[PDB]
Write a protein that holds these residues in place. Structure first.
Motif, PDB file in Angstrom:
ATOM      1  N   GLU A 170       0.844  -1.185   0.000  1.00  0.00           N
ATOM      2  CA  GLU A 170       0.000   0.000   0.000  1.00  0.00           C
ATOM      3  C   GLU A 170       0.882   1.239   0.000  1.00  0.00           C
ATOM      4  O   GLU A 170       2.074   1.177   0.311  1.00  0.00           O
ATOM      5  CB  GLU A 170      -0.947   0.020   1.205  1.00  0.00           C
TER       6      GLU A 170
ATOM      7  N   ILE B 289       0.906   5.820   0.684  1.00  0.00           N
ATOM      8  CA  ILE B 289       0.402   6.840   1.594  1.00  0.00           C
ATOM      9  C   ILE B 289       0.781   8.204   1.033  1.00  0.00           C
ATOM     10  O   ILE B 289       1.747   8.336   0.277  1.00  0.00           O
ATOM     11  CB  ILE B 289       0.956   6.634   3.027  1.00  0.00           C
ATOM     12  N   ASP B 290       0.004   9.226   1.402  1.00  0.00           N
ATOM     13  CA  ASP B 290       0.289  10.591   0.976  1.00  0.00           C
ATOM     14  C   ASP B 290       1.588  11.133   1.559  1.00  0.00           C
ATOM     15  O   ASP B 290       2.033  12.208   1.141  1.00  0.00           O
ATOM     16  CB  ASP B 290      -0.871  11.512   1.357  1.00  0.00           C
ATOM     17  N   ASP B 291       2.201  10.424   2.504  1.00  0.00           N
ATOM     18  CA  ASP B 291       3.486  10.811   3.074  1.00  0.00           C
ATOM     19  C   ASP B 291       4.667  10.325   2.245  1.00  0.00           C
ATOM     20  O   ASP B 291       5.814  10.503   2.670  1.00  0.00           O
ATOM     21  CB  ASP B 291       3.608  10.283   4.506  1.00  0.00           C
TER      22      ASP B 291
ATOM     23  N   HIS C  88       5.436   6.951   1.260  1.00  0.00           N
ATOM     24  CA  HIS C  88       5.978   5.746   1.871  1.00  0.00           C
ATOM     25  C   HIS C  88       5.168   4.552   1.390  1.00  0.00           C
ATOM     26  O   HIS C  88       4.032   4.696   0.930  1.00  0.00           O
ATOM     27  CB  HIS C  88       5.958   5.820   3.404  1.00  0.00           C
TER      28      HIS C  88
ATOM     29  N   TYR D  14       9.403  -1.019   5.461  1.00  0.00           N
ATOM     30  CA  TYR D  14       8.642   0.215   5.287  1.00  0.00           C
ATOM     31  C   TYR D  14       9.629   1.334   4.992  1.00  0.00           C
ATOM     32  O   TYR D  14      10.404   1.728   5.870  1.00  0.00           O
ATOM     33  CB  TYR D  14       7.813   0.524   6.533  1.00  0.00           C
TER      34      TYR D  14
ATOM     35  N   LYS E 288       2.967   8.322  -8.478  1.00  0.00           N
ATOM     36  CA  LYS E 288       1.976   7.899  -7.494  1.00  0.00           C
ATOM     37  C   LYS E 288       0.847   7.114  -8.149  1.00  0.00           C
ATOM     38  O   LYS E 288       0.315   6.166  -7.560  1.00  0.00           O
ATOM     39  CB  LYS E 288       1.422   9.114  -6.750  1.00  0.00           C
TER      40      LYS E 288
END
Lengths: 51, 86, 362
Positions: free
Chosen positions: C37, C39-41, C43, C55, C64
């Motif tokens: 998955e 993330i908007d961060d 990662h 991670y 993205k």
């Protein structure tokens, strides 16, 4: 005389970590080959300069 | 030949490739391709023959005799002839 | 000279200076894995074939939108950082997708059915070849057509000639593959059929000869009555719950569609229904001339005489006599087939290949 130099220089070959075992899957235009190790996963390494 | 001494790893031979060079598979599951020691010979071993390897470098050491310990049968019959066929 | 110094010189200089940093990044064994998955961060989590858990952040050479759960990425050896996304090359995975190398089967061989040939051409080939007709009209084009009729009417070759002129993606699936032995893999397969076909080109999903879930007599792959409701209703949701812009066409054909669940059709998606019957003496004269076009026939063989002898025969029975007549002349190695071969060919077809139907009335 060559057998004397081959055996004494074998210490560097015995202390060498050796090499892994893998198979070729696919290649790219960057001269990097995809090597698939049987116990491990797949890795992308550089091909030898001789071939 | 005697540099290896005690710290040895149990290997297994697979297939010959080059002169004084062969592929080995140890009990750890990681197969390595090393060079055959000068005191050994390719004709003195078998395709399934088990060999010895170094702890770190995993280089070929010595050819074990054609006796595989493993488990189960191990050596042979123990107190088996307790009955007859009649 | 002047233009190349202000264009090619600054661009090639940045490319050479960039690739020097690619050695410390795109070097190393370059382990790979499966994306979990994002993330908007910036990662993600990647699992290599050795099943670790890592991670890390998102590096360059990746977008993205390109990151999707279940894809392949490229990790790093030491830093264990994602180098970039690796797209799947050499076809989209499974190659049995029937990519249609296009043997180019034309409409001249299916000739004589032209009454029912122009029926499927307007609801399938017409919106693909001439989309401006349906777009400017305002009506929504149909998603396919269902075919019903006795075996031998040419229902297999009807859909084959349509995909030839469209030059688009077309699929051929056997109806018996919809059910597998493992419980739960039946509807999982139907999800991947329409998913991959809908991504590349206005494809067409054609499943021929559907015997699925009837007269079972299956010891191995039988899943009980639970596989019945999951596998069938999965195909119905692909025509209802699955959204599409109209580029996916579904055409189903088999010998008998009455045994199938009628709720699976849902004829608000399919507004076209084509039936088939036995040809008359005038149609068989055109079909016979098709197979004999490339065949060498003698002077004593009449085309109208062979059609007159035909009684209760389909399009496949006509080719069966043309094939049997060719095998008789092949044993004697005759270029032109004589009239004696057609006499023995019609007797063998009407005996074995042609069996009296269970209709029996009159």
């Amino acid at each position: 005389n060559d057998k004397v130099r081959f055996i004494k220089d074998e210490l560097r070959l015995l202390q060498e970590p050796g090499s892994y075992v893998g198979e070729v899957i696919k290649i790219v235009s960057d001269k990097k080959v995809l090597v698939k190790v049987q116990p491990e996963g797949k890795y992308i390494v550089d091909v030898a300069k001789d071939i | 030949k005697r540099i290896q001494s005690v710290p040895l790893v149990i290997g297994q031979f697979l297939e010959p490739i080059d002169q004084n060079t062969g592929i080995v598979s140890s009990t750890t599951g990681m197969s390595y391709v090393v060079r055959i020691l000068s005191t050994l010979d390719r004709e003195l071993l078998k395709p399934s023959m088990s060999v010895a390897l170094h702890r770190h470098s995993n280089a070929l050491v010595d050819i074990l005799p054609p006796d595989s310990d493993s488990s189960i049968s191990v050596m042979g019959e123990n107190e088996k002839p307790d009955v007859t066929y009649a | 000279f002047v233009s190349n110094s202000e264009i090619l010189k600054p661009f090639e200089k940045k490319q050479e200076e960039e690739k020097k940093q690619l050695e410390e990044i795109r070097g190393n064994p370059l382990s790979i894995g499966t994306l979990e998955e994002i993330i908007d961060d910036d990662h993600a989590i990647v699992t290599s074939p050795t099943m670790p858990d890592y991670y890390v952040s998102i590096l360059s050479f990746v977008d993205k939108e390109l990151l999707e759960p279940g894809c392949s990425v490229l990790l790093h050896h030491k830093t264990m950082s994602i180098v970039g996304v690796l797209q799947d090359d050499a076809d989209p995975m499974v190659s049995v997708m029937k990519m249609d190398k296009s043997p180019t089967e034309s409409y001249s061989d299916i000739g004589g059915l032209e009454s029912q040939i122009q029926e499927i051409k307007e609801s399938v080939e017409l919106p693909l070849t001439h989309p401006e007709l349906y777009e400017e009209m305002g009506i929504k084009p149909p998603k396919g057509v269902i075919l019903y009729g006795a075996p031998g009417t040419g229902k297999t070759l009807l859909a084959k000639a349509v995909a030839n002129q469209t030059s688009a993606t077309f699929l051929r699936i056997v109806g018996s593959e919809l059910i597998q032995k493992y419980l739960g893999d039946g509807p999982r397969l139907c999800r991947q059929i329409f998913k991959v076909a809908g991504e590349n080109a206005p494809s067409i999903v054609f499943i021929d000869e559907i015997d699925a879930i009837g007269t079972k007599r299956y010891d191995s792959n039988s899943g009980g009555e639970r596989e019945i409701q999951r596998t069938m209703l999965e195909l119905l949701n692909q025509l209802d719950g699955f959204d599409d812009r109209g580029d996916v066409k579904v055409i189903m054909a088999t010998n008998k569609i009455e045994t199938l669940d009628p709720a699976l059709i849902r004829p608000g998606r399919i507004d076209r229904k084509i039936l088939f019957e036995n040809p008359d003496l005038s149609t068989k004269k055109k079909i016979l001339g098709i197979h004999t076009s490339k065949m060498n026939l003698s002077e004593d063989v009449n085309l109208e005489t062979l059609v007159t002898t035909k009684d209760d025969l389909s399009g496949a029975d006509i080719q069966a006599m043309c094939t049997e007549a060719g095998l008789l002349a092949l044993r004697e190695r005759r270029m032109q087939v004589t009239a004696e071969d057609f006499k023995q060919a019609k007797e063998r077809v009407m005996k074995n290949k042609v069996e009296e139907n269970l209709e029996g009335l009159y």
